[PDB]
Amino acid sequence: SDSQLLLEPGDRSHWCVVAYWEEKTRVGRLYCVQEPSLDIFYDLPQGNGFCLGQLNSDNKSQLVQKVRSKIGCGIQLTREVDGVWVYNRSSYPIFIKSATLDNPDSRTLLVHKVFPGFSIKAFDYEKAYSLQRPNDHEFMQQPWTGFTVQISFVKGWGQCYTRQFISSCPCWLEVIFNSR
Amino acid sequence: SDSQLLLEPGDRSHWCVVAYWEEKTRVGRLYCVQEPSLDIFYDLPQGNGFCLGQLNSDNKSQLVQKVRSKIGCGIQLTREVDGVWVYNRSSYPIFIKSATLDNPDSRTLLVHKVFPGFSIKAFDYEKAYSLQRPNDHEFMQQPWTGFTVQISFVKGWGQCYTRQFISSCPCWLEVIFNSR
Numbered sequence: 378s379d380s381q382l383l384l385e386p387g388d389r390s391h392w393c394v395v396a397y398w399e400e401k402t403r404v405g406r407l408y409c410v411q412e413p414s415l416d417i418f419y420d421l422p423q424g425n426g427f428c429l430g431q432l433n434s435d436n437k438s439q440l441v442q443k444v445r446s447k448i449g450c451g452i453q454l455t456r457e458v459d460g461v462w463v464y465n466r467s468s469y470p471i472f473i474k475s476a477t478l479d480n481p482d483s484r485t486l487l488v489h490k491v492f493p494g495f496s497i498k499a500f501d502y503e504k505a506y507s508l509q510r511p512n513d514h515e516f517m518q519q520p521w522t523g524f525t526v527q528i529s530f531v532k533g534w535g536q537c538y539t540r541q542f543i544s545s546c547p548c549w550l551e552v553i554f555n556s557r
Numbered sequence: 558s559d560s561q562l563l564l565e566p567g568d569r570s571h572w573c574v575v576a577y578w579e580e581k582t583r584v585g586r587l588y589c590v591q592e593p594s595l596d597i598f599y600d601l602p603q604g605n606g607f608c609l610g611q612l613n614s615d616n617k618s619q620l621v622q623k624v625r626s627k628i629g630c631g632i633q634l635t636r637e638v639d640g641v642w643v644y645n646r647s648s649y650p651i652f653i654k655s656a657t658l659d660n661p662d663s664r665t666l667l668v669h670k671v672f673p674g675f676s677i678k679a680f681d682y683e684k685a686y687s688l689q690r691p692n693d694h695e696f697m698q699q700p701w702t703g704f705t706v707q708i709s710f711v712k713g714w715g716q717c718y719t720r721q722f723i724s725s726c727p728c729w730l731e732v733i734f735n736s737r
């Protein structure tokens with residue numbers, strides 16, 4: 378046409394970027410978010426946004442298939458006046474690690490459980506802007522942890538769970554937040 | 558606010574995301590790249606791209622100020638049919654860590670020096686697609702390392718340098734790559 382052929386340049390206005398993982402395998406392209414709210418869900422009639430059921434995956438594991446069938450309506454991420462909220466719209470708990478959810482003086486970040494229908498503030502811009510975790514050596518060596526949130530469907534990880542690391546979880550998300 | 562519309566919250570077409578760092582401080586908003594090539598520079602005549610001199614950094618270190626100016630014309634990042642290439646357009650070496658630059662059987666990833674005027678394939682889609690590093694425990698625990706490239710201007714880090722960690726470098730980039 379006239380405007381249908383041109384490719385626009387990039388921008389600084391996408392407020393987060395989402396990566397979907399199955400265990401150690403990244404599934405599908407990254408989803409870069411512009412509008413203030415996004416559903417992340419399994420099948421097309423179940424939300425407006427990032428559809429995970431459409432992603433072609435090489436991981437055919439039975440456990441991954443079972444968790445995928447439990448994602449259902451998934452989660453919603455929404456920018457609000459006081460930060461970014463994650464709402465659990467699905468019928469199973471989700472588990473979240475975010476640097477802005479924890480006491481800045483702790484030695485390690487915790488994984489937080491969010492029951493179906495409950496919400497949690499995934500990201501706080503003011504706290505992230507000034508965040509130092511001086512007692513967390515891994516954090517100081519990997520400061521991008523300050524703006525990357527990890528979310529697992531159905532299965533928890535870390536202390537008091539079978540899986541020590543998030544990359545053992547069947548279905549999980551990496552959410553990278555812009556500073557904004 | 559008054560008319561119905563067909564919302565798409567985001568897109569999959571930005572092929573990498575660039576974060577600029579000064580030591581342990583993230584500086585400026587993330588840049589989501591859609592154009593085939595991106596110039597990243599401190600000062601480039603009639604330059605159009607990701608200008609690091611315009612950002613208003615909180616890092617007031619004199620070393621950071623000196624290195625920032627040395628970036629000069631910076632680097633060029635180009636997405637091509639055969640992968641993503643980095644061209645060093647500055648007067649100083651740059652230093653790059655990328656999982657697709659290394660022997661997959663090694664224990665830890667190396668930092669690679671790129672002279673002024675030289676190029677390197679910073680990211681290879683097919684090598685990354687299902688890259689496994691079975692002797693690298695950190696990589697298996699943090700598989701997103703396989704899609705993220707770190708680039709430092711002027712100053713090296715790692716094995717052969719006083720700086721052990723990337724977050725000790727005065728001026729560096731985190732580049733998060735999308736899949737093909």
Ligand SMILES: [Cl-]
Binds near residue numbers: 387388389
């Ligand atoms: Cl912009």
Ligand SMILES: [Cl-]
Binds near residue numbers: 540541542545
């Ligand atoms: Cl484990």
Ligand SMILES: [Cl-]
Binds near residue numbers: 570
């Ligand atoms: Cl798209």
Ligand SMILES: [Cl-]
Binds near residue numbers: 668669670
């Ligand atoms: Cl080298």
Ligand SMILES: [Cl-]
Binds near residue numbers: 720721722725
């Ligand atoms: Cl160091």
